[PDB]
């Protein structure tokens, strides 16, 4: 099956930022034809730790910017929703509606996304056990969702630290396609946080174990990003990472267990 | 004064709310030292299963809660799940409760603060004690003056919550702290036998109040049936924690 | 039942240190007649993180120093063993043989302690669940132990941090007398560690929940201690702490659940 | 060269050791690129239950292991539990293994190092990756030149271990790293279905070798019966990790 790569800047800092990242993602989509690329960016960071942190430029501006990326590069789109009313307007441009980690249990939000007819990708809550995502998928199917993804992004391990229990990949694969969030899994919640040095090794682990796609927030200059500055992957490094995981996936694939 | 927030997990009917409210009223008269706040949810918006009980709706719930406040003169608290609900709920709720999974949702917190009511945030199972400082800051920015942080356990491996009591003195630096005695012993995705021992610990350590979901017949509850405290055991636990608090309070750190 | 208070300097830094702490413990034993005091100190710190840290002055010197405390003040004694051969010599002076946390599963060590006829106190391993101490008690009884204690000293919570799950107290009480380690429970393993500011609040929690005794490492000047300098309680504060827990125990006692 | 440490958890008999050793020898001939080390314990000194199988003693175990090395020319490794055992075990053991619970016992580590043999320390379930630096330092101080650190999972809530793969690159800073594929999936006080997926992850991340307890009939094993890999599946897993390593090694960080 075509490998999925969801990538883009964490937040829609500006329409210019999106087009710049979109251009590179488009270039990579032309090279890696065996990969299905989906451009990602949030119109709002609704769960920042501090009230003083950057949130965004609003839904309207965000949807408009994402539409430009889709029209200019012909790339599929994904963004996250935070409250039920946002599903409808967002569904106008988003091919995949993303459900934030902390909201993976909010029934109305999941139902709102499912009835749009769009694909739905749920970030697995840091408090959730792998086997408990079965009911999350059940809610989505109940709501009309036909294309469902579950994204592994770490589990609470002590304070301000997340661990990736790779046993979750084959467990969740029992009821949905699985995506591995390479940048969210190395963040240190309320750290100041994150450790970029572990992004690559863990993504290699993900593809060796076996998943249906990877999720990576990428920015031209992570050091200057307005959100997740400690975990976003430098755009210049995206190509090499993708080539590497495709190579590891190929050699490991014959050993992937059947569900 | 010491705060005691109690009531059935969900508003299964205003009939249930009236039976529990009657008991809460009686204790309210017996323990004048304590401030009682009646609690119940008009919607269980985060059930694991799509087939579980959610409730009878916001309107039916506000009506029922309104009846309790009018029939017993008790303060009220209920939780909201999306920003638009803050305004209508603030009509009856003296304290607006923010669910644990939603403790980081800026708009929900701001919407609760805008109502001018007191706000009680359930500390997420994913949050470290010191990270609640920012939660308080958001509420203050939104105009909230009476802010509470409720300890309800922290993720400890899978399907288990542990109570790190170091959180009580840490959170007290920026807000009044409440201890959720029934939620802290639940096993996500609980053990009633640990409710009393841990609530005794909470008052020995020092808190500003306790939170307890209570039902006449927990086993018959439509939500949190495994952790809700039988209504008949409430008086005994309250008298017990008041006695322990009386003695231990001498040592609560400044 | 008489409340147990096990206290003393973490390590036998010198015979002079022991006698100084012993004098104060003796004074407190005369005041708090309802308490059973047991003087504690290790002749060897066999599990230090660094090879350069203080270990001790040997078993011989240690036993001799402890014997002096017992002869001079008439106080019961306890110290820990690290290998089976140490049980016999140590049993000559120790009323209670302590089993280190990391060694709570070492069958031969537990058996060696049990056959001495002395009481045995096992520090619960940071990796052990409360219900798994049932087999630890079974091993000790199998080995001849008639007086057994289980000591709560925290559980691994993420890296370099320990949490105290107070549910362990009533669980372990099902098969043995329970002791709460007030100083070990606030240490940050490999922290540099520990947080002395939490010693008092947590010990209050312990007695409110209900335990059979408390364990506290105390030193005249913790800041200058050769081991556990970040968690040992200043000797001057011991009296107040004991009075406080006795008061809280009394008021909470009528509510202690029956096993 | 890449290291593969494998053998039955316990020396249930030298008869068992010979059957497994025969298979390990065959793979040794098939995979010349890999260095095989036969492993088995002469004593399970940390069983949860006093009524569980421990073994036939040190002497019987050393004898059995001695037979494997002589009959197959395979290197040997076994674990010690108390300092006095280092010397007698060093007679046959090329690598002395230190149990996870005992990774902080200074005298045991020093005794292992004094023998002049290589030392492999199982990382305690209570240890953070960076704290193994001090473990290595103790061994170096004791005269050890060939030092290995084995990842075998970390305490995650109760009766569960999680493998934090960030540990591999962190520990590689001061020692050769081995991944225990069978111990990492056990549930203290396991799931065989996760052995292969996680070992694939280990080689994709990058390690210096793998550790696997294997038995002809795991279900009939006297120890770790729930995690031991069936002997017949060993060749397939080895070929698989060698292929993955061949491709992924290009990306192992310096």
From Swiss-Prot, chains A, C:
Pathway: Carbohydrate biosynthesis; 3-deoxy-D-manno-octulosonate biosynthesis; 3-deoxy-D-manno-octulosonate from D-ribulose 5-phosphate: step 2/3; Bacterial outer membrane biogenesis; lipopolysaccharide biosynthesis
A single GO BP: monosaccharide biosynthetic process
Cellular compartment(s): Cytoplasm
EC number(s) stated in the UniProt entry for this protein: 2.5.1.55
InterPro entries, alphabetized: Aldolase_TIM (IPR013785), DAHP1/KDSA (IPR006218), KDO8P_synthase (IPR006269)
Catalyses which reaction(s): D-arabinose 5-phosphate + phosphoenolpyruvate + H2O = 3-deoxy-alpha-D-manno-2-octulosonate-8-phosphate + phosphate
GO molecular function, one term: 3-deoxy-8-phosphooctulonate synthase activity
Listed transmembrane segments: none
Keyword Nucleus tagged: no
Gene3D superfamilies: Aldolase class I (3.20.20.70)
Cellular component GO terms, alphabetical: cytosol
Assembly and binders: Oligomer.
Family the entry assigns: Belongs to the KdsA family.
Protein name as catalogued: 2-dehydro-3-deoxyphosphooctonate aldolase
Gene designation: kdsA
UniProtKB/Swiss-Prot annotation, chains B, D:
Source organism superkingdom: Bacteria
GO terms under biological process: keto-3-deoxy-D-manno-octulosonic acid biosynthetic process; monosaccharide biosynthetic process
GO CC field: cytosol
Alphabetized UniProt keyword annotations: Cytoplasm, Lipopolysaccharide biosynthesis, Transferase
Disulfide feature: none
GO molecular function: 3-deoxy-8-phosphooctulonate synthase activity
Catalytic activities: D-arabinose 5-phosphate + phosphoenolpyruvate + H2O = 3-deoxy-alpha-D-manno-2-octulosonate-8-phosphate + phosphate
Enzyme nomenclature, EC number: 2.5.1.55
Pathway assigned in UniProt: Carbohydrate biosynthesis; 3-deoxy-D-manno-octulosonate biosynthesis; 3-deoxy-D-manno-octulosonate from D-ribulose 5-phosphate: step 2/3; Bacterial outer membrane biogenesis; lipopolysaccharide biosynthesis
Major site of localization recorded for this protein: cytoplasm
Location of the protein in the cell: Cytoplasm
Family assignment from sequence similarity: Belongs to the KdsA family.
Oligomer and partners: Oligomer.
HAMAP family: KDO8P_synth
Annotated protein name in UniProt: 2-dehydro-3-deoxyphosphooctonate aldolase
Source species of the chain: Aquifex aeolicus (strain VF5)
